[PDB]
Symmetry: D2
Subunit: 427 residues, 4 copies
Amino acid sequence: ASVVGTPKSAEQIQQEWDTNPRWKDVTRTYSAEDVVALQGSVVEEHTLARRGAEVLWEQLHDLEWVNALGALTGNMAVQQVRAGLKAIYLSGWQVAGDANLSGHTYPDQSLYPANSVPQVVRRINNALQRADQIAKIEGDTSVENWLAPIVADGEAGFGGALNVYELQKALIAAGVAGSHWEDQLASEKKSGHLGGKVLIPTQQHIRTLTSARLAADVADVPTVVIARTDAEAATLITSDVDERDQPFITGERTREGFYRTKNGIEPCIARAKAYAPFADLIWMETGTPDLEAARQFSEAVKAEYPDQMLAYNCSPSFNWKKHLDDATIAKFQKELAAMGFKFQFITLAGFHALNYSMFDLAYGYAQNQMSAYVELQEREFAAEERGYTATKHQREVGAGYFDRIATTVDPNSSTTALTGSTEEGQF
Amino acid sequence: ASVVGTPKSAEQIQQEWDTNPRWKDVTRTYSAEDVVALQGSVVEEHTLARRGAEVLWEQLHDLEWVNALGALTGNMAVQQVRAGLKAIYLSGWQVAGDANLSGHTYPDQSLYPANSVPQVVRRINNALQRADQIAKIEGDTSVENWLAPIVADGEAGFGGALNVYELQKALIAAGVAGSHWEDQLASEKKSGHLGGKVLIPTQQHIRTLTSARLAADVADVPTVVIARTDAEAATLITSDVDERDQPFITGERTREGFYRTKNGIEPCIARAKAYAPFADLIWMETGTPDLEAARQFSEAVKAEYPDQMLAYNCSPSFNWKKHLDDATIAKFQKELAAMGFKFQFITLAGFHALNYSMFDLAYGYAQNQMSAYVELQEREFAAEERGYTATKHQREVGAGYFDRIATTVDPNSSTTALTGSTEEGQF
Amino acid sequence: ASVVGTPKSAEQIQQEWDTNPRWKDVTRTYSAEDVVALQGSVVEEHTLARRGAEVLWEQLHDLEWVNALGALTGNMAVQQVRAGLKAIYLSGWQVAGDANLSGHTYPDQSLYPANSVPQVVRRINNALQRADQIAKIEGDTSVENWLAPIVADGEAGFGGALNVYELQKALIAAGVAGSHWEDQLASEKKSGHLGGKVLIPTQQHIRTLTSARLAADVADVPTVVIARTDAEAATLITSDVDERDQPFITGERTREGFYRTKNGIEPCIARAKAYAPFADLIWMETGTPDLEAARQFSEAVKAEYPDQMLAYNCSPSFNWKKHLDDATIAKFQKELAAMGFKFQFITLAGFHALNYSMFDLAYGYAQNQMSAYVELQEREFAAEERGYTATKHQREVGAGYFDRIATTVDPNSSTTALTGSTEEGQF
Amino acid sequence: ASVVGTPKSAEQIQQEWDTNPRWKDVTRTYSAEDVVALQGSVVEEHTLARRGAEVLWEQLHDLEWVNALGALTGNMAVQQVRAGLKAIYLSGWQVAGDANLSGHTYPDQSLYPANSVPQVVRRINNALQRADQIAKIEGDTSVENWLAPIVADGEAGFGGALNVYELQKALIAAGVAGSHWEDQLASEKKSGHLGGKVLIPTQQHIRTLTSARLAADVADVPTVVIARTDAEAATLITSDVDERDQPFITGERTREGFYRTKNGIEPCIARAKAYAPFADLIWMETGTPDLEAARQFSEAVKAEYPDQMLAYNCSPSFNWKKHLDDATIAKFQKELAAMGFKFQFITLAGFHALNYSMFDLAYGYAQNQMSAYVELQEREFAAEERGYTATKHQREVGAGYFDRIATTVDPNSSTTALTGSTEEGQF
Ligand SMILES: [Mg+2]
Ligand SMILES: [Mg+2]
Ligand SMILES: [Mg+2]
Ligand SMILES: [Mg+2]
């Protein structure tokens, strides 16, 4: 007997849908009653998911554009926010390669356990929460919002609409702000820039986008839903059942029973228009960093959905200087923003920053031992004027915060950490 | 009914102890019969734990000295090996800060779930095996041994001798090559360079080393056992029961009941000698990077144990250029090796390399967007002449390997990944 | 920039502590300001933990007494509730034996990973939530509250005050209603009815209780804190520092440095009184089910703290019929309730029901194959008149629920589960 | 530089395939060189997987038949072996319902994380290893082989051939003896006795079986591979690309693009013959327990493959007494064995034993408190004459085993468990 967590009435839900500007362009093919019927008698409050999704939605409208870097560890996200970024991108590619629950290194093909990204989302939020806590006790107002919104990779759902539903639900439980879903066959999922991609029917992805929204509704949070299409390079599709896809079907079939389909921007535009009512943002994977191709896509889509916001993947899978000059590179994101691409991210930033920095250090260490490390430590000290604080690793990880907890429990405790530490007397 | 995994006889074990040089200076207060009684009727083979211990032991004798860098992710270890390092250091500090099973960020005080380091060991080995697999299909002989031995942090055991036993056993099952254990009170465990450290009786740590050895023997592998003392800065000890510790006891007690003790190199020397018979390597934590203090410790210990190998923590908790000139820094590790310090490691190398590189990239990204990232990419392309291979992230993470698996299952498969990928056409 | 999760002011918190009857007899040695200082700028809502603690507190006052059985799996808790129980006990013993994150079977000695119980708490709540969801779609009002409050085993905290804090915080995040803590040395933690137990100083356990409370306050939920003392059988204590323990210290020391101490009800009474101000419930481990011993403890404690509610462990570690007659056995709990024992539980109920039920079936199966199983099924069908529902396992595990989700996403889905199932046409 | 784990040469592998009777009827569409190319330079030994597979294979030939019950917890498997069973069945249904890594309760539709079953296989082997260890120190020869082979559910692979490969590998790493794979679309996977099942092309499942074999070969263990067909009830198939399936295709298509197909024993027989060369055992799901249908299937298959062994699911999804009489029920398994069904199992034995047993105890407990539990304890005492040993829960879970470890580390330890325990003085 308790009123804690009591579900909202179908009427209240309906009202929010009809009045909140958040749902201005959102179409739901199910009823408010349907949502309530799935909430049981208790609805858990998902604080981080709600706040994150609200902050993300706001930033997408108030800022020229929202950009982010892929993070595969908690500390990565902390450094990103400490450096001034206002969003965190959680790459599935990076999770596959260096942060998934199987413990194995995998290429980007939906090989890892379906709850891996959810765990990293939870992990990133914990890391940001610790930074937040530490900033409070240090009186550090350097960062206005440590709990930056997280946009996580839902890939192809790892199966059908039910798998999609459970993933969205888990991402929310972990505190995610937004999630993206691609129109690829889950069992043959390929990285956006790897070959051998197989698309699924247009309607099937709409079911995916619908299931993703339903989980969010049942969890009572305004999670930002992003639809991604891989039709730009995919030359295969699982079925010709959907009339909207038929125009592109060549008729040829593979041993596996797939159908050949004409790839390119035309299919992406069609699918994007079909997903628009079910997506807060739309993303088109491309084979190169091309502002003109992006313009073409944006204009064609906005021609039918003026307010449709877009997302763009500034992929490390591109050999940037091989395609663009420094001038264009420097204005790349600003131009995309000018064309409606409000969420931009470098998917594999973390994988590259982590692998390079360690290769570089290890190499130098192999040749000059301590000298190579001291150079890094000195760069860290030097970056302190830019706001860097990890040089003092103890406090950076909460040594001061836990000392506070220790002294709160027992002020006369003789086992506190920072007092007498080398960090206190050498940094 | 099978002979697979049939345990060795006590006699066979005894002969190994009596005739294998590996055990030349190893004291065991239990018997071969005791080991057998604990093995049940089936003994699991631990391939990576055996190979790693064998390789590690060998390198400790054939090389001028073995150095390593702390790694907290699989890719980290891969880069370390790719760069030439022949050993991997698994820091418990880094695990607490950014890689433990609780999902939280913690200061180095044994706050995380006890099976966290074992998981990282398993993860590191998996990552190294993938690199190994990839190198084989790429005909890459750049690296002689991808499976570098892993030396992991056992901290203070997370409890009693039984907790120690389970941790060692879990580390072995994951493929660890060596593990270190410190003489601190588990419940008040502190980072070597944090204050408020509490020592446990000398005999208690001997029970710990004995327990670590027993686990290794029952798992039938020659795991390298490292003994660590924190008596250099620790001014508290749990009890005065051990006569060997009494000389340092002042008589004063804290409100918790701890005994004040006189810290310094003197207590470290006494404990080191007491641990020697139960340690393959001995490590003394220090408050500064001082070669003279190190000599003092080494000469004192070797005076009674000439063949006793030592390990040294070239800790990032030291402000290096504040204590030494570049000349000393440059020869630091070489000088230590000349004094018997055969295993040297930079504990928090991973934390700092990861935190700094992401802050650097994120900061520049916040100001110039793409230009900041392109700079990293170009440094990566340039680093290839040094042997760096992660620029091509797809193959680096196994895309080529799984393609091989796919074409092995079905050579006519129309869903391979690398063929038609941007990496193939742009790198 | 969001108001979601904004922390309460120190004033608001202080007011709650001064006016809410919940805190009537609760002593807090820290201030509201200390709590606020640890909450960062965002406080996550813990719906289940809040509701659960409120319900548990109310039940302890409205019911003659609250009883429960140990549950180690989700389905177990579901059946317990389905059967009419209004509380779930989560035994640490059972987790060690058949449900901890190391995957190993362990005796009750704090050998498993410290986040094991929290994970089981989360699991039990998920199971109850599924049942709640199913009941709602089946219009089943059989159970008033599927979300029964969970009382979990915190054992000895797995270390110091900080480990205690993290465990309580984790239990709360998983949705626990109450948690218990014992005054034993974590590193030598023993099951209540095993020998070799080592107590810690009275004041140290008060620190544990204080830390457990602090964690709940920072988490902003009225978690029920339970204090357990093992002084009935323990003959050892870590230190003689505390003046409240000295009367029982005999002066003798063991080789490990522990002090011999006189066990019995007298030390338990002394400790219970000392813990009273920091415990919503006090529990004393006993070596036999004795109503007179229980009365002795209850009256002595209530003499100074009239409103102090107690908890009692009706342990399977007792050979019940060897100590009591059926008449006493039948009135046992009712009697304890009359004496202030408002929370009673059979710790190892799950372990025994599971191990016995499977041995019995397996044994019979090995002799009469299918006949043995048919007997079980028939007993299940029979149990349906009593309220049993697992006979139809498909709906019991949510098949009907996910069909609802499936049809909400796509009404014309041709892949629903129950339609055309053998359960639908054979049950 | 070590020879430990050195891979076998292709020649050695080829010889085994040509000479070992284990591979007598095994068709491999890839070469020995292909296997070697994927093993890198180190092959980990999988003791439990090898021993288990070997034992299982042997028992499948030397016994009239091998039967098992579904196990979802370690203790469950232990009691099954204690009772005399010589194999353990690991149901995916039970894992989804009460033992998967998501912590949620799910119907049987491949909703849980892909590495869930592997974790349970590891858990089950750990539990059995403890029982083996305990038995050794107790001088208990009651059980000849505690390490009974485990047959695990690989379901539909959780994706494509690569997902299948990873699952098999993980199962093998965990120590599985055999694994089964079904010809259902993973993204729509349904319990064998639930409706809405979609089959995949015949050739596709052959790729699955081939991938499962390849994974075992690379892992260098003779894993028993089981092929399962769901064509008996499935009225849908993803594609009509395979000519072996077209005879059953009706021509109609669903909105999702699925093809209607004619279900029955006929499609099962055809698929079984096609899988034969790639399966050590073949299993067809049935809607009812029918000995004649089983004969029909068995004879038709053995007509072309005389040595092809079969597996049968004595499913709890059948209302046994509603279909058969006690006479048939009693001979059922013996009959099936007489027809080539060498591996028989009751899939949901653990779910029902666990759910019923707890409901029964909880119900009585809710009514008569302690009286209800004493009844169970008394039954447990009585069962001791049949071999039951869990009554003494302390030793059952290894308290005596760890006491052995403790006294081995320190024979003078004053903190042993069994001495002074109530189990010792009351049982
Ligand atoms: Mg991705
Ligand atoms: Mg450490
Ligand atoms: Mg307990
Ligand atoms: Mg199954």
